[PDB]
Structures are given as structure tokens and as C-alpha cells.
Amino acid sequence: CTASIPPICHXRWR
């Protein structure tokens, strides 16, 4: 999970 704009999340990995 990253605080991008928009943010990015690959489930429970990043």
C-alpha cells in the first residue's frame, strides 16, 4: 500500500 495520488493498494501486500 502506497500513499500515491490516487493511492495504490494490492490487497494486503503493498
Short mmCIF file of all heavy atoms in Angstrom, two decimals:
data_model
loop_
_atom_site.label_atom_id
_atom_site.label_comp_id
_atom_site.label_asym_id
_atom_site.label_seq_id
_atom_site.Cartn_x
_atom_site.Cartn_y
_atom_site.Cartn_z
N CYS A 1 0.83 -1.20 0.00
CA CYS A 1 0.00 0.00 0.00
C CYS A 1 0.87 1.26 0.00
O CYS A 1 1.73 1.43 0.86
CB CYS A 1 -0.93 0.01 1.22
SG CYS A 1 -2.54 0.80 0.92
N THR A 2 0.62 2.14 -0.97
CA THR A 2 1.38 3.38 -1.08
C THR A 2 0.46 4.59 -1.02
O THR A 2 -0.71 4.51 -1.39
CB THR A 2 2.19 3.42 -2.39
OG1 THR A 2 1.47 2.76 -3.44
CG2 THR A 2 3.55 2.77 -2.21
N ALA A 3 0.99 5.71 -0.55
CA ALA A 3 0.22 6.94 -0.44
C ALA A 3 0.31 7.76 -1.73
O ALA A 3 0.67 8.94 -1.70
CB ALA A 3 0.70 7.77 0.74
N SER A 4 -0.02 7.13 -2.85
CA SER A 4 0.03 7.80 -4.14
C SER A 4 -1.18 8.71 -4.33
O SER A 4 -1.98 8.90 -3.41
CB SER A 4 0.08 6.76 -5.27
OG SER A 4 1.28 6.01 -5.22
N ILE A 5 -1.31 9.27 -5.53
CA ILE A 5 -2.43 10.16 -5.83
C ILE A 5 -2.92 9.94 -7.26
O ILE A 5 -2.43 10.54 -8.21
CB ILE A 5 -2.03 11.64 -5.66
CG1 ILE A 5 -1.48 11.88 -4.25
CG2 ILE A 5 -3.22 12.54 -5.93
CD1 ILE A 5 -0.91 13.26 -4.05
N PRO A 6 -3.93 9.07 -7.41
CA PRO A 6 -4.53 8.36 -6.28
C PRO A 6 -3.59 7.31 -5.69
O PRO A 6 -2.58 6.94 -6.29
CB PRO A 6 -5.76 7.68 -6.90
CG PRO A 6 -5.42 7.53 -8.34
CD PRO A 6 -4.57 8.72 -8.69
N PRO A 7 -3.92 6.83 -4.48
CA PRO A 7 -3.12 5.82 -3.78
C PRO A 7 -3.19 4.46 -4.46
O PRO A 7 -4.06 4.21 -5.29
CB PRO A 7 -3.76 5.76 -2.39
CG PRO A 7 -5.16 6.21 -2.60
CD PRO A 7 -5.11 7.23 -3.71
N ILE A 8 -2.26 3.58 -4.09
CA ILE A 8 -2.21 2.24 -4.67
C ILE A 8 -2.19 1.17 -3.57
O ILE A 8 -1.47 1.30 -2.58
CB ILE A 8 -0.98 2.05 -5.57
CG1 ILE A 8 -0.87 3.22 -6.55
CG2 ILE A 8 -1.07 0.73 -6.32
CD1 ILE A 8 -2.09 3.39 -7.43
N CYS A 9 -2.98 0.12 -3.76
CA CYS A 9 -3.05 -0.97 -2.79
C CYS A 9 -3.30 -2.30 -3.49
O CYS A 9 -4.26 -2.46 -4.23
CB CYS A 9 -4.16 -0.70 -1.77
SG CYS A 9 -3.79 0.67 -0.62
N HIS A 10 -2.41 -3.26 -3.24
CA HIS A 10 -2.54 -4.59 -3.84
C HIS A 10 -3.01 -5.61 -2.82
O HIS A 10 -2.32 -6.60 -2.55
CB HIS A 10 -1.20 -5.03 -4.44
CG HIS A 10 -0.89 -4.39 -5.76
ND1 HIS A 10 -1.86 -4.05 -6.68
CD2 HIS A 10 0.29 -4.03 -6.31
CE1 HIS A 10 -1.29 -3.51 -7.74
NE2 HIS A 10 0.01 -3.48 -7.54
N UNK A 11 -4.19 -5.37 -2.25
CA UNK A 11 -4.75 -6.27 -1.25
C UNK A 11 -4.10 -6.06 0.11
O UNK A 11 -4.24 -5.00 0.72
CB UNK A 11 -6.26 -6.06 -1.14
N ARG A 12 -3.37 -7.07 0.58
CA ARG A 12 -2.69 -6.99 1.87
C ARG A 12 -1.19 -7.13 1.69
O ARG A 12 -0.48 -7.57 2.61
CB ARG A 12 -3.22 -8.08 2.81
CG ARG A 12 -4.52 -7.71 3.50
CD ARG A 12 -5.12 -8.90 4.22
NE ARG A 12 -4.48 -9.15 5.51
CZ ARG A 12 -4.65 -10.26 6.22
NH1 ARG A 12 -5.45 -11.22 5.77
NH2 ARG A 12 -4.03 -10.42 7.38
N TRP A 13 -0.69 -6.77 0.52
CA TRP A 13 0.74 -6.86 0.22
C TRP A 13 1.39 -5.48 0.27
O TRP A 13 2.10 -5.15 1.22
CB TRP A 13 0.96 -7.49 -1.15
CG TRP A 13 1.01 -8.99 -1.11
CD1 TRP A 13 -0.05 -9.85 -1.13
CD2 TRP A 13 2.19 -9.80 -1.04
NE1 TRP A 13 0.40 -11.15 -1.08
CE2 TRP A 13 1.76 -11.15 -1.03
CE3 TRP A 13 3.56 -9.53 -1.00
CZ2 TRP A 13 2.66 -12.21 -0.96
CZ3 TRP A 13 4.45 -10.58 -0.94
CH2 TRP A 13 4.00 -11.91 -0.92
N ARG A 14 1.14 -4.67 -0.75
CA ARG A 14 1.70 -3.33 -0.83
C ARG A 14 0.60 -2.28 -0.76
O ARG A 14 -0.48 -2.45 -1.32
CB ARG A 14 2.50 -3.16 -2.12
CG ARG A 14 3.05 -1.76 -2.32
CD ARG A 14 4.12 -1.43 -1.30
NE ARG A 14 5.44 -1.87 -1.73
CZ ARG A 14 6.17 -1.24 -2.64
NH1 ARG A 14 5.71 -0.15 -3.22
NH2 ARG A 14 7.37 -1.71 -2.98
#
